[PDB]
Amino acid sequence: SAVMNVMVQAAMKAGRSLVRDYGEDYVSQADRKAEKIIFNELSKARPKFGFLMEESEEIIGEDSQHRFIVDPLDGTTNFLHGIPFFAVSIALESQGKIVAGVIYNPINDELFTAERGSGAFFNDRRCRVSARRRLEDCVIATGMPTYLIELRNVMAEVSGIRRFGTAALDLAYVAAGRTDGFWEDNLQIWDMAAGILMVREAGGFVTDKEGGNDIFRKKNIIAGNEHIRIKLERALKK
Amino acid sequence: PQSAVMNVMVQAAMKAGRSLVRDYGDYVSQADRKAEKIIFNELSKARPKFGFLMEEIIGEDSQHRFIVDPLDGTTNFLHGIPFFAVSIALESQGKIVAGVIYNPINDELFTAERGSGAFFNDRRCRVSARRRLEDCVIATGMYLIELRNVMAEVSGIRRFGTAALDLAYVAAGRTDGFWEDNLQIWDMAAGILMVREAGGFVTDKEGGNDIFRKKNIIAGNEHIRIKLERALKK
Ligand SMILES: [Mg+2]
Numbered sequence A: 001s002a003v004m005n006v007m008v009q010a011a012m013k014a015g016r017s018l019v020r021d022y023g024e025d026y027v028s029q030a031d032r033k034a035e036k037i038i039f040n041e042l043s044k045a046r047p048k049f050g051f052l053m054e055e056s057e058e059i060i061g062e063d064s065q066h067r068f069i070v071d072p073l074d075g076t077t078n079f080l081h082g083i084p085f086f087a088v089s090i091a092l093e094s095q096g097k098i099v100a101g102v103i104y105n106p107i108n109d110e111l112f113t114a115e116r117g118s119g120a121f122f123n124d125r126r127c128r129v130s131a132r133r134r135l136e137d138c139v140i141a142t143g144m145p146t147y148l149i150e151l152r153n154v155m156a157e158v159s160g161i162r163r164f165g166t167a168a169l170d171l172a173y174v175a176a177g178r179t180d181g182f183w184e185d186n187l188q189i190w191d192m193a194a195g196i197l198m199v200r201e202a203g204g205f206v207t208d209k210e211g212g213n214d215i216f217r218k219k220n221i222i223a224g225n226e227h228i229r230i231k232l233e234r235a236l237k238k
Numbered sequence B: 001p002q003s004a005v006m007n008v009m010v011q012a013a014m015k016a017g018r019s020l021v022r023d024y025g026d027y028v029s030q031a032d033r034k035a036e037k038i039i040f041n042e043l044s045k046a047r048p049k050f051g052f053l054m055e056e057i058i059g060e061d062s063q064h065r066f067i068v069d070p071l072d073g074t075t076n077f078l079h080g081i082p083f084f085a086v087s088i089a090l091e092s093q094g095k096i097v098a099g100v101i102y103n104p105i106n107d108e109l110f111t112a113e114r115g116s117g118a119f120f121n122d123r124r125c126r127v128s129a130r131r132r133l134e135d136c137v138i139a140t141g142m143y144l145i146e147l148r149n150v151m152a153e154v155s156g157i158r159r160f161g162t163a164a165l166d167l168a169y170v171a172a173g174r175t176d177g178f179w180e181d182n183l184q185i186w187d188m189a190a191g192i193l194m195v196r197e198a199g200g201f202v203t204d205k206e207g208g209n210d211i212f213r214k215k216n217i218i219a220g221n222e223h224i225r226i227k228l229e230r231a232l233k234k
């Protein structure tokens, strides 16, 4: 779709800039530059669309019902440290519903896209959540915010825990079937918006920690395939 | 340029690497074995008398052995998480003198030789110059008391699922330190030298030198390592 292509292009241009800055305060700069590039691209492409970008005053668009939701650099600490795991995330929200999302890991050149009703793609092939049915078989990703109890709970149950230091990339990974599930607390809307669509379009399910749909409100998330998501929920509550 | 045996190990790593990336894009076992045979054949053809301790062979030359993890990060590899590596160390008279860790996916080549420095893609590695845990990203692998103690002190914890690569990252200064329990000699052998050659230190969790017997480790620049040692003891 036309808007998807604009989103992808913005993300890739931001991505190239990131890789270039990754090459070399300077992290804030890299983040700010990626953001400028995305804003410029998406503004030029959709001048009446709103913008919700990480830690930045929301721009209400002339077209009040469409806004891009952006994390120009997801995995900032990874980025600061030289850990080649971070991503650009752009979601499009239309009428309060996420309808398109791009997560781009510019180091591995890994493009995750989904549009509502179209499925999720990992570089132009359909990707799907994993088919695992038991936690014992699972690699679950997580991020730092009771957390220790949850961690203990899940650690007891799973084959392995990953903590990559990204949110959006982590969701892309569940959506691509690379990890079997994800949970995190204190996540922002831009951390999650494209990833949640990705997971759902990949045939997974995404709830808040309490198993509902107040993700953006509760700032927390459990994602995985239907089976893993429920058991994760169970494990987390124990 | 790189020494004769380093060049050999790098080649074996590059080649096991290239193969794993192919097997990447029971199946996990075959890849592991394939990488291993590639490494084995490559290093056999290069130093026929050397020992091999792989994830044992005692060679005609009792003073030298290769310590090999043909695929570190097996679970990642199975799951398609692009974070795994080949690890080859050379041990001479009980001392790790050469080491290679190769992440074939990112094409990240880590090399060190005793007295010659650690390198990441032709760049000299230096462990990070961080001194406060608060500014630190610490890597670990699969006690919750110890994780809490560390986690409450640091800016971040990472669990990427690859011990050799985690040590290589410590050495390159990508993370500020690393600790793990129940680690194998092949997991640690090349990594320990990198960190050392990058100016960091390696101890067992107790703070002593019995890493291979304890099968545990804390790695980092000393300021960070001691702080981790403290945090793991509380
Ligand atoms: Mg960000």
Ligand SMILES: [Mg+2]
Residues within 6 Å of the ligand: B055, B069, B070, B071, B072, B073, B074
């Ligand atoms: Mg292995």
